[PDB]
């Protein structure tokens, strides 16, 4: 149960999509900041050979991809690779790559490909996705997949993020080699290429959990039929198989009228309009449905609404 919030023509997030080939920067070996179109890339590295504290490091660009260049590590200090190392004071830490999108930009999916990490020695790591400084999604990966020509590192779970942290995790070993061999080869920001958004609406499903705590929120879809563009064409809401967090509103000429993007971890929902609509039947809002599952599994059905742009 949630009241409609009108969409608006201002402060619309720029949506970032497209595949970015991170092997095309080797001309400058070492930058503190890589600057591509829509995002920047930084790096955090070890404070010394015997200090696991993270400090600003250089992004190291090569024909294989990007890695982090710590001045010193306790062993196997690789310049072109993101490294997890143990330190003899008895604690461990990983180098970091940081993908930071430009202000007012968001992605709803990522497909990340690494290099220098398959072919024998166990290699593992994790990608964290943040939106506004909340954790939104993690993706863990490992050279137990099926070779350097194997993606499956997908994240259309949660939609919105503005920040990726890519780091290594512990592979199990002790002092010669650990998770190192891991170099970011490409990053593809998922989503269909749309027109230019003429309106935007955002709210957050925040519901009563009770005393048994939080579990998860789910995007049911949308009941709405009879929705029409202001030119009078019928609208058909739909998902792709396996991707409950993106509803497309298409117009029966095939064109996109709106998209809804949902972020389950925070409950955030974001409405993008591309064509003016006719006043939605009955109420005047587009009603989407949610199921608020529990830590047990104790369920509760509700809804969030938004009034679209209507000439």
**Footprint on this chain of Ca ion (rule: CB under 5 A):** 68, 78, 83, 121, 177, 180-181, 212, 280, 283, 285, 287, 296, 298, 305
Instruction: Tell me how far apart the terminal alpha carbons of the chain are, to the nearest angstrom.
Output: 27
What is the closest distance, in whole angstroms, from the C-beta atom of residue 270 to Ca ion in the complex?
18
Shortest approach of Ca ion to residue 303 CB, angstroms? 7
Q: How far is the CB of 225 from Ca ion (least distance, A)?
A: 10
In this complex, which beta carbon is closest to Ca ion, that of residue 119 or of residue 195? Answer: 119
CA proximity to 261, closest of 39, 15, 5, 20: 15
What minimum distance in Å lies between the beta carbon of 48 and Ca ion? 13
Q: How far is the CB of 83 from Ca ion (least distance, A)?
A: 4
Q: Residue 89 phi/psi, 5° resolution?
A: -60, -15
Task: Quote the least distance from Cβ 109 to Ca ion, whole Å.
Answer: 28
In sequence order, what are the residues at sequence separation of 6 or more whose Cβ sits closer than 8 angstroms to the Cβ of residue 142?
Answer: 122, 123, 124, 125
Q: Which is nearer to Ca ion, 51 or 287 (CB)?
A: 287
| CB-nearer residue toward Ca ion: 78 or 197 | 78
Separation CA 173–CA 98 (nearest Å): 26
Q: How far is CA 241 from CA 136, 244, 248, in A?
A: 21, 8, 12
- Contacts of 237-246 with C-beta under 8 Å, sequence gap 24+, read 242/156, 243/156, 244/218, 244/219, 245/108, 245/156, 245/157, 245/158, 245/159, 245/219, 246/108, 246/156, 246/159, 246/191
Q: Which residue, among 25, 54, 31, has the nearest Cα to 167 in the 3D structure?
A: 54
* Residue 65: CA count within 13 A, CB half-sphere: 21
Give the shortest CB-26-to-Ca ion separation in angstroms: 16
**213 contacts: CB under 8 Å, gap ≥ 6:** 294, 295
Question: Which residue, 154 or 209, is less far from Ca ion as judged by CB?
Answer: 209
Which lies closer to Ca ion via its Cβ, residue 227 or residue 265? 227
Nearer to Ca ion by Cβ, of 35 and 296: the residue is: 296
Token representation of residue 67: 């890695």
Indicate the residue among 43 and 107 with the shorter CB distance to Ca ion.
43
Nearest to Ca ion of 264, 280 (CB atom) = 280
SS3 102: coil
CB of 82 to Ca ion, least distance (A): 6
Compute the distance between CA of residue 203 and CA of residue 304 in angstroms, rounded to an integer: 8
């Amino acid at each position: 149960n949630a009241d409609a919030v009108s969409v608006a023509k201002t402060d619309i997030p720029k949506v970032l999509t497209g595949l970015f080939d991170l092997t095309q920067h080797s001309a400058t070996a070492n930058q503190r900041e890589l600057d591509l179109d829509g995002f920047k890339i930084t790096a955090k590295g070890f404070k010394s050979a015997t200090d696991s504290a993270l400090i600003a490091a250089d992004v190291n660009a090569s024909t294989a991809g990007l890695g982090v260049a710590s001045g010193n590590s306790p062993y196997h200090n690789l310049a072109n690779e993101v490294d997890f190392r143990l330190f003899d004071n008895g604690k461990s830490a990983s180098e970091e790559l940081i993908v930071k999108l430009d202000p007012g930009t968001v992605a709803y999916g990522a497909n990340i490909k690494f290099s220098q990490m398959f072919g024998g020695e166990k290699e593992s790591g994790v990608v964290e996705f943040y939106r506004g400084g909340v954790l939104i999604s993690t993706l863990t990966f490992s050279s137990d997949a099926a070779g350097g020509e194997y993606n499956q590192n997908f994240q259309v779970q949660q939609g919105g993020f503005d920040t990726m942290v890519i780091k290594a995790t512990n592979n199990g070993n002790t002092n010669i080699s650990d998770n190192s061999d891991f170099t970011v080869k490409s990053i593809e920001f998922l989503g269909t290429t749309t027109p230019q958004a003429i309106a935007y609406g955002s709210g957050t499903v925040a519901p009563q959990w009770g005393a048994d705590g939080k579990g998860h929120i789910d995007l049911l879809g949308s009941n709405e039929v009879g929705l029409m563009t202001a030119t009078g064409k019928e609208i058909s809401i739909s998902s792709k198989a396996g991707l409950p967090n993106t509803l497309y509103g298409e117009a029966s000429d095939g064109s996109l009228v709106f998209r809804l993007e949902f972020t389950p971890a925070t409950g955030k929902w974001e409405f993008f309009q591309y064509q003016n609509m006719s006043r939605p039947l009955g109420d005047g809002d587009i009603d989407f449905q949610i199921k608020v599952v529990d830590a047990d599994g104790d369920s509760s059905l509700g809804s969030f609404a938004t009034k679209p742009l209507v000439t």
